[PDB]
Copies of this chain bind each other. A is one copy, B any other.
Amino acid sequence: KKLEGKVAVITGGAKGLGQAIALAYAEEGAKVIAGDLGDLTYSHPNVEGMYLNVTDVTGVEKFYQSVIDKYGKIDILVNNAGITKDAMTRKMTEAQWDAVIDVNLKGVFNLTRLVGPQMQTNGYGSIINISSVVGVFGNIGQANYAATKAGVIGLTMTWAKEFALKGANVRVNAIAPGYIMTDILKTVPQDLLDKFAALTMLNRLGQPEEIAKVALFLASDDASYVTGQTINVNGGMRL
């Protein structure tokens, strides 16, 4: 199978895109660890749920070491955990700003600074960061979120360079999804979601499996000459 014998960590893996990615990987033979604040909303023999708060530095170290102790190595990392706290910038509170940067940007750093160097030392890995169409185009009411999702692209390019030093076969890429119905959209008015669908060339929102399949491509050796990239998976949207 495509990921047979590979160990994959998925942050925010309890539901939504993270669930879809975990299941796609597990169906292709990966040993998957789905880390989340919440219990998994699903079961698969090759998905282990673990508690993970990507904002708790001490907790991230404990999670990382627990995975290494049990599974030996981490071949694939998907930095998928993410939140929104939307507001017009005129009204956005310090807490709305801080929380989004902490999960979506620092939380990516907190775990990658452990996993990525481990991949370099092992001479192999694939890291997939989850950006957003909002990071590529900006979006009203989302200065915090857009900063993080554009920021993830900066991390992606930097780490694609760094972790491939000294001949290490480590790739780092990002996926920038368009709009997919998950709980992250709970505060987004339906008028906007309908507008977003109409802005795609395919005239529709995406499904979680449509992101998972691209994540599977990038994690696998099929994408062996793809690194440093941000792949837009957005039905052709311009936002």
Which residues of A line the B interface, CB within 8 A? 57, 88-90, 92, 94, 97-98, 101, 105-106, 109, 112-113, 116-117, 120, 134-135, 137-144, 146-165, 167, 169, 171, 178, 201-203, 206-207, 210-211, 213-214, 216-217, 221-229, 231-236, 238-239
Smallest CB gap from A158: residue in B: B138
Is there an interface contact between B167 and A203, defined as CB atoms closer than 8 Å?
yes
A228 in contact with B236 given A143-B158, A158-B142 (CB within 8 Å): yes
- What copy number does this chain have within its complex? 4
The answer on a CB contact under 8 Å between A137 and B162 is no
Q: Contacts A161-B201, A201-B161, A217-B217 given: A147-B142 contact, CB under 8 Å? A: no
Q: A89-B158, A90-B117, A146-B155 are in contact. Are A201 and B239 (CB under 8 A)?
A: no
Chain B hits for A223, CB < 8 A:
213-214, 217
A155 vs B146: C-alpha distance when bound (angstroms): 6
Contacting pair A227 B236 (CB below 8 A): yes
* Inter-subunit contact B89/A201 (CB<8 Å): no
Complex: how many Å from CA A161 to CA B139?
7
Contacts A146-B154, A154-B148; A227 near B235 (Cβ below 8 A)? yes
**Which single residue of chain B is at the shortest CB-CB distance from A165?**
B140
Chain B residue numbers with a CB within 8 Å of A147 are 105, 109, 151-152, 154-155, 158
Q: Main secondary structure on chain A at its contact with chain B?
A: helix
- Can you give 15 A-B contacts (C-beta < 8 A)? A89-B117, A89-B162, A89-B163, A90-B117, A138-B154, A138-B156, A140-B158, A140-B162, A146-B158, A150-B157, A151-B154, A164-B202, A167-B203, A213-B223, A217-B217
CA distance A64 to B156 in the complex (A): 35
- Nearest CB to that of A202 among chain B residues? B164
Partner of A105, one of B120, B151, B158, B216: B151
CA distance A203 to B161 in the complex (A): 10
Q: Would you list the 7 A-B pairs with minimal beta carbon distance, nearest first?
A: A138-B157, A150-B154, A151-B151, A146-B154, A138-B158, A90-B117, A228-B236
Minimal Cβ-Cβ distance residue in B for A180: B225
Q: Are B234 and A225 in contact (CB under 8 A)?
A: yes
Q: How far is the CA of A32 from the CA of B11 in the complex (A)?
A: 40
